[PDB]
Amino acid sequence: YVAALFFLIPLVALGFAAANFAAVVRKPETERMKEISSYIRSGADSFLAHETKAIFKVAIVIAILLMIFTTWQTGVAFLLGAVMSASAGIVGMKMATRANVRVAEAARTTKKIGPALKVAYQGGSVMGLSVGGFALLGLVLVYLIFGKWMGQVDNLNIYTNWLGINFVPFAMTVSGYALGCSIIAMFDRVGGGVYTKAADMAADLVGKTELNLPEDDPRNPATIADNVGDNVGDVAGLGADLLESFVGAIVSSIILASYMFPIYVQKIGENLVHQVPKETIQALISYPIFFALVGLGCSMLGILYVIVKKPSDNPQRELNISLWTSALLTVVLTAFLTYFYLKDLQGLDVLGFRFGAISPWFSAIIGIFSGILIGFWAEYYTSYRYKPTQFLGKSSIEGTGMVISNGLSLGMKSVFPPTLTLVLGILFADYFAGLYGVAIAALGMLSFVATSVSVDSYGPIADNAGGISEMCELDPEVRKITDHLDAVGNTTAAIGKGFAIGSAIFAALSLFASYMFSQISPSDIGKPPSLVLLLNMLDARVIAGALLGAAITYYFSGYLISAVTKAAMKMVDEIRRQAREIPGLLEGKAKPDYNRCIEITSDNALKQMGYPAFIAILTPLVTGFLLGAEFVGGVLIGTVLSGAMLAILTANSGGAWDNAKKYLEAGNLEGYGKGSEPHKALVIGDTVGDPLKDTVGPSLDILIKIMSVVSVIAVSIFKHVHLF
Amino acid sequence: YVAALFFLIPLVALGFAAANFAAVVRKPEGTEKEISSYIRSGADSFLAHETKAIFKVAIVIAILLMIFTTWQTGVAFLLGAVMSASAGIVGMKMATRANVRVAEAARTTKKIGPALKVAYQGGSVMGLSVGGFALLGLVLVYLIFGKWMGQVDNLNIYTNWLGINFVPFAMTVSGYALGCSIIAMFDRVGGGVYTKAADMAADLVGKTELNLPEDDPRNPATIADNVGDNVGDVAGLGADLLESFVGAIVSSIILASYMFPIYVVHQVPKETIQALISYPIFFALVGLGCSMLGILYVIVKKPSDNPQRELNISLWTSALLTVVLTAFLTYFYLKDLQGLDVLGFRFGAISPWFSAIIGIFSGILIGFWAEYYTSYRYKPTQFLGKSSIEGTGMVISNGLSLGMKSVFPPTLTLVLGILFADYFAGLYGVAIAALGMLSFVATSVSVDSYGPIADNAGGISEMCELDPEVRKITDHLDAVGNTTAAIGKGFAIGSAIFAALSLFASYMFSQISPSDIGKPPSLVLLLNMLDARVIAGALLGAAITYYFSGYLISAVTKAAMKMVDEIRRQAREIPGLLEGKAKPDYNRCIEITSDNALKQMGYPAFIAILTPLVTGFLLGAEFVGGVLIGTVLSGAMLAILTANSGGAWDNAKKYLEAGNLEGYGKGSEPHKALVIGDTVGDPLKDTVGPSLDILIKIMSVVSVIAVSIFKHVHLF
Ligand SMILES: O=P(O)(O)C(O)(Cn1ccnc1)P(=O)(O)O
Ligand SMILES: O=P(O)(O)C(O)(Cn1ccnc1)P(=O)(O)O
Ligand SMILES: [Mg+2]
Ligand SMILES: [Mg+2]
Ligand SMILES: [Mg+2]
Ligand SMILES: [Mg+2]
Ligand SMILES: [Mg+2]
Ligand SMILES: [Mg+2]
Ligand SMILES: [Mg+2]
Ligand SMILES: [Mg+2]
């Protein structure tokens, strides 16, 4: 049976990632290189172990609560998704820590971009296969065990658990899975981002501007902290976040299809004429899973060809060819799959398939194209090759104040072009296949999460390799090879963040729909969807909730930035004290103390990482129990809008600042060099952008999805338990 | 009849402002007055050019309105535009004339009292001008078109040629508010761009690069800084706040006018609708009278203990008097009406008074939060300042974090206020509270303008070698003033949010046609946010607000970069300027800033005007409503954040300058980082922040005016 092969696909992805990891094992690693690799891996492993222990304790608590109030299988799937996210993060962290020194040694010996690009892509591919395989494995496991083995997909009827809980079985199970994935991603990424960005700000600022020392200089006591933070915050958090986004895209369609069946009914003399055939509903539920499986398989084939493919001097050319080929093949195979799976079905027109069975494929096509433009728009704004980043670089001569003001404008201006792309994508998907197609586009925009995760992971390995080169005092040319891979990596990371936020926006609209559906009760089960899908924004409660949600998102970003700044200030103080008190460090005859900086950042991150996830979880609950369901819908809408805007702005502005600093550093500016005051302004801009790109930017989509899932899960009790 | 007295009230405000201007126009002269004349000439030239451009564009817009809509709409448009322009220019002239007088008084007396009196008199002239002009234009329109012409008597939805369904007096007041808003937007954009660009360039080049004192005469941009303060923070302030006051009034006026035809067999007696339409005008008149009484008591009384103390005492007394008189007015005027429950008056005739009180208290809480977040007397600004020791990047990051965090308390206050206001009086309450939050705009205008005058005094003190105590007193007053500016911006954004909700209501009402006149109001008040078009429009509106802020910042930064380059070149090439024995070329800096401002002032207003038309003609009315919601949210957030963060940076820089940090003084590297933070916040404080509420209201007004045509005339 081919269903067995498609379900085994994710295990094949995991096996291929393991094979690539083995291929990267036994590669040539110097004794100092091996020592630095062991140090970085030990630091990252310790931090990740502490973070994972805390996160899984909290996850056990959350799972017990979910099992109590909601279906026990809901908590079981929550644990499944949480373990999936944690495993993806740990795998990525280990792969990066192992491959940084391998890529550095390759770049040092061959002196050619080919081998280093090959090794770094092997690491990124291992991580991407881990992400995709874990996501799809957990999702298909939930599907089979709870819907197929337990038959939760067969019932598809609204139940009432004790305490007055109105739920759908498979809906609750998949929602719990997505919620676990999102919680684990939130905790991991928050911790890693705080750590890495604080270390980066302190180290880069103190070394570049105050000590006049090179970047990632071994003399700098914060270099190890910066490298380990890159390994943890931008490598493990990256995988967690992207796996969570993939699972959310799939799960939005899953819940929408599940709710579609029992809701589309007609009351007739108190006889409830069911309006949609169950077979069609099951086909629509399985469609997104099979589509994600096809995307994962196509990404696997593309990555295999790339690893076997001819190496190119420019890594960007190979990355672009790989993603283009994988996307085209996925689109074609998905067209065929969508036609065959939904061919000659019944009820599609009723659920919004105006064109027909192929209408979800048209919506998925809209998602892929919309994402491509969002990435392109990000590239123009964040790349020095394009005009805007160059103007920011030219702004260096005028001063730090001009650089900061110019960067802020580029980010605020940057939001409009992608947002128009998203607005057009949403409208066309609704025209092509209603809300189900909205969710299908959310999924399609991230259909090939494996390749994007692979490239984004490929970046950090090159960064950590570059840091190893300066500390180990390797030849300047080898460092130059590492820098070339990192310059493309920064822009590709911004593109990935844009993809994530777009898929999150689509899935969040579909989750608004699912929430409005969840607001229904058995006595009100016969309402027409027109009355169910109504959220009047003239209701004072709805608009008040929208305002409160936007404000909550803004304060959340502010608190993240505050954590990063506190850590970075502590680090700057420690670096100044070490430089003043320790003799011989600036001359190179003394070895500073990095453990103090590592401890400062680790403690601050582990202490401050918990509160934001708790906020994101409890805000919907408290707001709903206080002001009802309409206020919660308004809060969700405001959060979605504010999060999209702020994520786009922060990612683009941080990338622009960093790329302008690299532009000046590369020597493309006329007359001004590393020690110039304009370079100090670029360093200040890059430090300001460090938290914005990898701390505030990525967390916003996770917050949106987690909040929407919490609301859809808990709306049943808070409609009648509203205090006011 | 007392109606005559209430209509004369605005003339009383104008007469009292003129009397104050004449009394303080004594303008005591000092050592060469020449520099004051120079600054006044520059400011007047810039304002004249700006006004010429704005009035050309206004004539074009008025012709278009008269053609497509009722000519009375364009006439009221011109009336409101002229009112706002007169307020702005009057305030700018008064400040430019009284800055040197107050500075000389403060120098001679060596005491804060006399300078406080003169500066508060200037602010009072400005605030009385704003309030009196608003109420004069409003009562004139009311009387001429609704009372004498009987537009209040008709109260029926009409359909003029081309298929526009409108209400007469509603359209007239909409045109009035739209004209005021266009003029305010243009004036504030120009003045803010000019002033903030000059300030950024001067501070960076002098303090960080040249190591020169603030407002040093050797610096060729100091004159530019003072004149820009006069243009952006003296005229723009009045334009923007007068526009906010007029918008608060007109929102309630329009909602009430649409209700009588929409509610249907008429559910609400016409007398009740006319009474509710006339109520907000009399309420604003009473508020203006109370503000005048408070300003009179303050100006006649002896000097206050603290400059903040006098402003707060005046505001408290005015608010209490307004509350009492408004209670009496609301009871007497609406006591014997009927059908007040149908429109939303849960408690009865006193519901609008409760909603206005809720709005006033929400504004007071917003001010409390602003004072908490933007004053160095409290914890957050102190932490931001201490962040300077950790570098400039740390200062910037902490400032951004503080700004983003400050948005929460005010937003929660606004949520509670919206909820409570709806409970007492419905959406009419949301609008009456929008007005109540700004019931005493005169005193707020006075206090807000008082800051810039003290700033100009400090700049002039540095320009002409003067005793240190003079500039110390002026800087003290200016330190108090910046927080007052932030509190005023908070008041403005809150009133804008309330009026924007009421405008959503009026917009949904306007979407009705004569053939669809019988629909139940419950079905009319629906704007489904699950409609893909509505949410897409919300996203696009948020993006439009963000790109608008980005364009403002880009214009300001380009102008400031050109200015910084010119100042650096002047300092490097001219010998003896840094040695203190020379004098540079200020005219070049002034010309650069003025040219850039005049070139960049047009695009943002055109965006704010055309966004609704294009979005509606492209996607329909639901998309336009979504764009309105997205714009409202994004603008509220961005305005609050920018204002609060800029105020925090500036107050932390003053904290370090005052010597409150241990061991680190003026000219220190941490002080350089603090100056960089304040300069980065400069455009955010007075250019991007205030423009957002004007953008929201202008966009909502344009949409409400043209919703009828695009509701069914949509290309897609
Ligand atoms: O991870 P980050 O963005 O901090 C950094 O990697 C940015 N970067 C450097 C070159 N390309 C991007 P670095 O710490 O090397 O300054
Ligand atoms: O233009 P602003 O109001 O920010 C300013 O007046 C701020 N300030 C100065 C003293 N007290 C407040 P200056 O540019 O003179 O630094
Ligand atoms: Mg860096
Ligand atoms: Mg790095
Ligand atoms: Mg580094
Ligand atoms: Mg960086
Ligand atoms: Mg300043
Ligand atoms: Mg000034
Ligand atoms: Mg000044
Ligand atoms: Mg300033």
Author numbering:
A (entry chain A): 2 to 30, 32 to 726
B (entry chain B): 2 to 33, 36 to 267, 275 to 726
Paper text:
Membrane-bound pyrophosphatases (mPPases) facilitate the transport of protons and/or sodium ions across membranes while catalysing the breakdown of pyrophosphate (PPi), a by-product generated in various cellular synthetic reactions – into inorganic phosphate (Pi). Similarly, VrPPase has been solved in multiple states, including IDP-bound (VrPPase:IDP), single phosphate-bound (VrPPase:Pi), two phosphates bound (VrPPase:2Pi), and different mutations at the hydrophobic gate. These structures show that mPPases are homodimeric enzymes, with each monomer consisting of 16 and, as found in sequence databases, occasionally 17 transmembrane helices (TMHs), organised into two concentric rings: the inner ring (TMH5–6, 11–12, and 15–16) and the outer ring (TMH1–4, 7–10, and 13–14). Each monomer consists of four regions: a hydrolytic centre, a coupling funnel, an ion gate, and an exit channel. Here, we solved two TmPPase structures in complex with ETD and zoledronate (ZLD) and monitored their conformational ensemble using DEER spectroscopy in solution.
